[PDB]
Amino acid sequence: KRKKRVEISAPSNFEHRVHTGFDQHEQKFTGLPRQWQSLI
Amino acid sequence: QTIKCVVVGDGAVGKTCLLISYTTNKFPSEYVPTVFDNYAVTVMIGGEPYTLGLFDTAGLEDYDRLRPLSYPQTDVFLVCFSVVSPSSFENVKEKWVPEITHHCPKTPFLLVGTQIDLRDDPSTIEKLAKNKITPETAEKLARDLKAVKYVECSALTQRGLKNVFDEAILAALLE
Amino acid sequence: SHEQFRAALQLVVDPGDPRSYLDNFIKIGEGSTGIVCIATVRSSGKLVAVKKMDLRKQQRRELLFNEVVIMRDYQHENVVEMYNSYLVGDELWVVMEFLEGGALTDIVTHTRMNEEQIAAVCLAVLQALSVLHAQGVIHRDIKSDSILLTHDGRVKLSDFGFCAQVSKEVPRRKSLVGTPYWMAPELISRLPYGPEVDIWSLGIMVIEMVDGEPPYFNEPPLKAMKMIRDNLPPRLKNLHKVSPSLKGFLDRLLVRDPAQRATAAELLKHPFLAKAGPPASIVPLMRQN
Ligand SMILES: Nc1nc2c(ncn2[C@@H]2O[C@H](COP(=O)(O)OP(=O)(O)NP(=O)(O)O)[C@@H](O)[C@H]2O)c(=O)[nH]1
């Protein structure tokens, strides 16, 4: 409470949540966030 | 809780390699252009867990249409320039900061010098010499700009790598 | 890197295992770096304190060097005596004097101290800090918890784990070190800083002794740090209970500009400290009495 420090640890728990790519053929995105898909 | 950190900068600067070396202790041997990747890690801050969300964005001009969709709710930026590319360092001033200031004016940002280990490498210094950045030059630009601070690192050797994210994380949580 | 550090530490500690002459290891408290036990010397029955710090559970292992080197090379009436250190398994154990009066924290959370007692404490800490600062040692973690008391009320400075050294070759430190509510604003701003950070922290401790707690304590630590960083220096809430002497003192401690903050040596000559009671006057405030 009063003895809480600001130590920032090394990272842990890697998580690759999104990988967007670009179709060479169809000029299209693959692996968009579904939120963005409406916008463009 | 959760910190959102977006990494932008000129292409080839070393944004992905920075993130992959930090999160997994590996270097991607090849160079593949990023379109968009989102990673997450847990980071302990005084024994309390936070999710550090990391938004790896395209530097290449091809995917401009996409990039600022990353920007809403951003807690901190890393505006990256390779310290062996003066063009990328001038684009911090000319382009990147204007972008993030417009979309996210209250959001703190750090200037991140990448690839500092090639400051010794003679191969690349020859092409800097024939065509005719130091901490003191970047630190001025950080104080002017006004970045939270300047930090620098090498994704290969990991020198000051942890410190990049340490200062980014503190920047986010203070503001 | 774990083994290299363990071997480094091996060469710096005293050889052997203090379990060979100590009995009855009982946990007395916890800290950030590890736990403190009381133990008994088998031959004599004398109590000692033993600080145990696991090498694997430190965010910056290099800071463990301070736990040995400081009490070793800076013996002083107002510094906690360190007898020996050892490497037991994956732990640094430091054996030191047991201070029976406890921490100043226990006093300021359960009682209000008068100005003669406050001046006595401040005087002792500044005597210690002036000696440390003259050698370029910055404590970096001054607060009520780091001040321990003897039975008779003499004040000693402890918790040297977060120390750093300055010199002509390295006049400033950059590290984010300390405890949020006591951290100096220049340190939080991530500017280079010097021994002046300890004086701010001492100022925050004087606020502890008058108002019971540091400024912004009811807030979370990270928001408090932003407040310390951006706001003007914090004020005493119990202004009704405070002298112009004390207010004048505290104004020399809580100066945002490190350059205009008073030094320890400068503060030893301050009039407020002329009010200092002797060791005895702090004894009634202890939990026993
Ligand atoms: N010596 C050295 N080279 C590096 C470092 N970081 C990246 N590089 C080199 O520069 C290349 C850039 O890779 P990358 O991280 O994908 O850059 P990027 O900023 O994500 N490019 P884009 O925005 O198009 O995705 C790497 O393939 C590597 O060869 C570093 O820290 N040190």
Ligand SMILES: [Mg+2]
């Ligand atoms: Mg890439």
